[PDB]
Every structure is written in structure tokens, then in C-alpha cells.
Amino acid sequence: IAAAIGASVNYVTGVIARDKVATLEQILWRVLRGNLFFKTVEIEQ
Amino acid sequence: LTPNQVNDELNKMQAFIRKEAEEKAKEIQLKADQEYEIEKTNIVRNETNNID
Amino acid sequence: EQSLRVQLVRLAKTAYVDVFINWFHIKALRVYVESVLRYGLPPHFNIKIIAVPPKN
């Protein structure tokens, strides 16, 4: 909500072809850098 | 995972961000009290020399 | 060889105990550091070391 035109917080936009690869990244993320992600997803073509 | 699980972690995120910053901010203001005294003594000793 | 032999067994033994205490330092600190980083609140953790009888 209006914070991805700004820079008050950082968002990482990205396309990935598999929700599978999204998972592995989620694992790496949680285990070793703590619990600091908000994971949202939208379907593309 | 499920949206609920991801929201438990979300809550954790803003917890981390806040706690490391309070911890940072205590150290930051503690250097500011050492700096007040020291600068104050330095202005004074310089000046009394001039007055002398 | 004789002089080296006494010195070496003694040194290994002394070294051993020290290297062991340091190893256990790292592991204890590595579980605390990990725990705060993944879990967050509450500040204090319930930590136990459980001795497993052999092969279980």
C-alpha cells in the first residue's frame, strides 16, 4: 500500500518461473537470516 | 506457508527491526552524553587560558 | 626423539581439554544466537542439553 513508489521500506519485486524455486529461497531465508520476510504472491502467464 | 504462519513471521519482523534499533539508539545517545561533558571541559580550559 | 615424545604427549593432552572447552563455547553461543535470530520474543529461552544413551 503506497510504499513501493517510495522507499520507506524495501520490497523485492521479482518474477520466477516456478513457485517451487520460491520455496527453496523461503527455506534459505528463514533458517539462516531469521524470520524477516513477508511473502506475497500473484499469478502471471 | 499458510498466510497465518507468514503473518506470525511478519510480526516477528517488525519486532526485530524495532529491538535492534532501540539497542542501537541507546548506544547512540550514550556517546552523546560522553561528548557533552568532554566538549564542555575543553571549551572552558581554552577560555580561561585567554582570560588569564 | 625422546625429548619430543614427552613434550608432545603432554601438549596434546593439555591442548585437548582446552580445544574441547572452546568447542562447547561455540556450540552454546551458536544455539543462543540462532534462537534469538529465528524466534524473536520472548527474550529468554528454555535451553536443555539432553544426554542420549548410546545408539538411541
Which residues have a Cβ under 8 Å from the Cβ of B16 and sit 6 or more positions away? A34, A35, A36, C40
Give me the total of CB pairs closer than 8 Å, taking one residue from chain B and one from chain C: 7
User: In C, which residues are within 8 Å of B19 by CB distance?
Assistant: 40
Give me the total of CB pairs closer than 8 Å, taking one residue from chain A and one from chain C: 9
- B16 touching C (Cβ < 8 Å): yes
What CA–CA distance (Å, rounded) separates C41 from C29?
A: 18
| Alpha-carbon distance B22 to nearest alpha carbon in chain A (angstroms) | 18
- How many residues in chain B? 52
What CA–CA distance (Å, rounded) separates C35 from C45?
A: 8
Which residues have a Cβ under 8 Å from the Cβ of C32 and sit 6 or more positions away? C45, C47
- B18 touching C (Cβ < 8 Å): no
The structure was resolved to a resolution in Å of 7.6
Cβ distance C40 to A35 less than 8 Å, yes or no, reads yes
Cβ distance C41 to B12 less than 8 Å, yes or no, reads yes
> Determined by which method?
cryo-EM
The Cα-based distances of C54 to A35, C23, C51 in angstroms read: 35, 21, 9
